[PDB]
Design an enzyme around this catalytic site. Structure first.
Site, PDB file in Angstrom:
ATOM      1  N   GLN A  19       0.773  -1.234   0.000  1.00  0.00           N
ATOM      2  CA  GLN A  19       0.000   0.000   0.000  1.00  0.00           C
ATOM      3  C   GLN A  19       0.807   1.289   0.000  1.00  0.00           C
ATOM      4  OE1 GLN A  19      -1.946  -1.505   3.931  1.00  0.00           O
ATOM      5  NE2 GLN A  19      -1.966   0.720   4.129  1.00  0.00           N
ATOM      6  N   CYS A  25      -5.411  -0.195   3.443  1.00  0.00           N
ATOM      7  CA  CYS A  25      -5.493  -1.555   3.973  1.00  0.00           C
ATOM      8  C   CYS A  25      -6.880  -2.187   3.828  1.00  0.00           C
ATOM      9  CB  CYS A  25      -5.102  -1.588   5.436  1.00  0.00           C
ATOM     10  SG  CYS A  25      -6.005  -0.681   6.500  1.00  0.00           S
ATOM     11  N   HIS A 164      -6.539  -1.829  11.792  1.00  0.00           N
ATOM     12  CA  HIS A 164      -5.863  -2.212  10.545  1.00  0.00           C
ATOM     13  C   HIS A 164      -6.582  -3.393   9.882  1.00  0.00           C
ATOM     14  CE1 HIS A 164      -2.696  -2.897   7.697  1.00  0.00           C
ATOM     15  NE2 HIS A 164      -2.256  -3.998   8.281  1.00  0.00           N
ATOM     16  N   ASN A 184      -1.097  -9.605   4.752  1.00  0.00           N
ATOM     17  CA  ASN A 184      -1.060  -8.159   4.971  1.00  0.00           C
ATOM     18  C   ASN A 184      -0.900  -7.471   3.605  1.00  0.00           C
ATOM     19  OD1 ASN A 184      -0.950  -5.723   6.362  1.00  0.00           O
ATOM     20  ND2 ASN A 184       0.798  -6.284   7.644  1.00  0.00           N
TER      21      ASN A 184
HETATM   22  C1  LIG Z   1      -5.296   0.802   6.682  1.00  0.00           C
HETATM   23  O1  LIG Z   1      -4.291   0.959   5.976  1.00  0.00           O
HETATM   24  C2  LIG Z   1      -5.793   1.885   7.625  1.00  0.00           C
HETATM   25  C3  LIG Z   1      -4.938   2.966   8.383  1.00  0.00           C
HETATM   26  S1  LIG Z   1      -5.810   4.568   8.159  1.00  0.00           S
HETATM   27  C4  LIG Z   1      -4.748   5.764   9.034  1.00  0.00           C
HETATM   28  C5  LIG Z   1      -3.524   5.874   8.080  1.00  0.00           C
HETATM   29  C6  LIG Z   1      -2.273   5.197   8.400  1.00  0.00           C
HETATM   30  C7  LIG Z   1      -1.150   5.291   7.496  1.00  0.00           C
HETATM   31  C8  LIG Z   1      -1.269   6.061   6.269  1.00  0.00           C
HETATM   32  C9  LIG Z   1      -2.507   6.737   5.953  1.00  0.00           C
HETATM   33  C10 LIG Z   1      -3.631   6.644   6.853  1.00  0.00           C
HETATM   34  N1  LIG Z   1      -6.943   1.556   8.427  1.00  0.00           N
HETATM   35  C11 LIG Z   1      -8.195   1.575   7.992  1.00  0.00           C
HETATM   36  O2  LIG Z   1      -8.516   1.879   6.881  1.00  0.00           O
HETATM   37  C12 LIG Z   1      -9.227   1.168   9.009  1.00  0.00           C
HETATM   38  C13 LIG Z   1      -9.630  -0.277   8.630  1.00  0.00           C
HETATM   39  C14 LIG Z   1     -10.501  -1.027   9.636  1.00  0.00           C
HETATM   40  C15 LIG Z   1     -11.612  -1.804   9.157  1.00  0.00           C
HETATM   41  C16 LIG Z   1     -12.444  -2.528  10.084  1.00  0.00           C
HETATM   42  C17 LIG Z   1     -12.166  -2.474  11.496  1.00  0.00           C
HETATM   43  C18 LIG Z   1     -11.055  -1.692  11.982  1.00  0.00           C
HETATM   44  C19 LIG Z   1     -10.220  -0.970  11.057  1.00  0.00           C
HETATM   45  N2  LIG Z   1     -10.332   2.146   8.933  1.00  0.00           N
HETATM   46  C20 LIG Z   1     -10.109   3.435   9.423  1.00  0.00           C
HETATM   47  O3  LIG Z   1      -9.001   3.726   9.928  1.00  0.00           O
HETATM   48  N3  LIG Z   1     -11.101   4.366   9.340  1.00  0.00           N
HETATM   49  C21 LIG Z   1     -12.406   3.953   8.726  1.00  0.00           C
HETATM   50  C22 LIG Z   1     -13.085   5.140   7.976  1.00  0.00           C
HETATM   51  O4  LIG Z   1     -12.912   6.375   8.728  1.00  0.00           O
HETATM   52  C23 LIG Z   1     -11.509   6.750   8.908  1.00  0.00           C
HETATM   53  C24 LIG Z   1     -10.840   5.738   9.861  1.00  0.00           C
END
Ligand SMILES: *C(=O)[C@H](CSCc1ccccc1)NC(=O)[C@H](Cc1ccccc1)NC(=O)N1CCOCC1
Length: 217
Positions: A19, A25, A164, A184
């Site tokens: 990614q 993710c 994540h 992953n």
């Molecule tokens: C996956 O890569 C991410 C990290 S988002 C924060 C970030 C970190 C590094 C670089 C850019 C941004 N996580 C998510 O996408 C999580 C996934 C998830 C799904 C189900 C249960 C728990 C976690 N989702 C989020 O972080 N969000 C969902 C939508 O609103 C924003 C936060």
């Protein structure tokens, strides 16, 4: 139920993706789950477009592209949209872009998705054995996670509060230490060629069984 499962051995898992600096993710976990169902239903393994999800499953789905999203709402977008494009036709750029979905390149569809019960590792095991790879959220906010190299990962600082999105593609035990085989999206250089074996039946370690879901074609 089988004592061990590895969907990679059945040809249902595509190459590990990277990614980069984009928090996609959730998109990778979702296409990974659907890629397996596509193989089971059509006999062909095709990587699907995570970028398609990043660019198109947005606000209406509670998703924020490179700033995060949900696997369940990604599946809903695919259902509503009546398709998702192949990765080859709609490449991953690790950036938020304008929606450029084109049904001419549709490589898969989704008719529904199933959410498993909170914290039930036994139910998750059944689904991985009988249905296929399952999308899950894990608590990766610990430096030991990215630094993981091999073996069964156990972090005493982990909690059930997940952040994540990854993909469970199997399970088993390494000399008595039960684990979940997790794909992953941090590239081939992370962990065991892109995978991490996480402690299984250790009280929902890292929240792996907190929010599991899987799509169906
Ligand atoms: C996956 O890569 C991410 C990290 S988002 C924060 C970030 C970190 C590094 C670089 C850019 C941004 N996580 C998510 O996408 C999580 C996934 C998830 C799904 C189900 C249960 C728990 C976690 N989702 C989020 O972080 N969000 C969902 C939508 O609103 C924003 C936060």
């Amino acid at each position: 139920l089988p004592d061990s499962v590895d969907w990679r051995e059945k040809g249902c898992v595509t190459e590990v993706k990277y990614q980069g600096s984009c928090g996609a993710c959730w998109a990778f976990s979702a296409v990974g789950a659907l890629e397996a169902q596509l193989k089971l239903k059509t006999g062909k393994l095709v990587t699907l477009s995570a970028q398609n999800l990043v660019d198109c499953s947005t606000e209406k789905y509670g998703n924020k592209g490179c700033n995060g999203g949900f696997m369940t709402t990604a599946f809903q977008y695919i259902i509503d949209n009546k398709g998702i494009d192949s990765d080859a036709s709609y490449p991953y750029k690790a950036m938020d872009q304008k929606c450029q979905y084109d049904s001419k390149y549709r490589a898969a569809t989704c008719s529904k998705y199933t959410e498993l019960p909170y914290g039930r590792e036994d139910v998750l095991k059944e689904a991985v054995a009988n249905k296929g790879p399952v999308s899950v959220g894990v608590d990766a906010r610990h430096p030991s996670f990215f630094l993981y190299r091999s073996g069964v990962y156990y972090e005493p600082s982990c909690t059930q509060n997940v952040n994540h999105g990854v993909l469970v593609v199997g399970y088993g035990d390494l000399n008595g230490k039960e684990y979940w085989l997790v794909k992953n999206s941090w590239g081939h250089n992370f962990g065991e060629e892109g995978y991490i074996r996480m402690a299984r039946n250790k009280g929902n370690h890292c929240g792996i069984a907190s929010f599991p879901s899987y799509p169906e074609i």
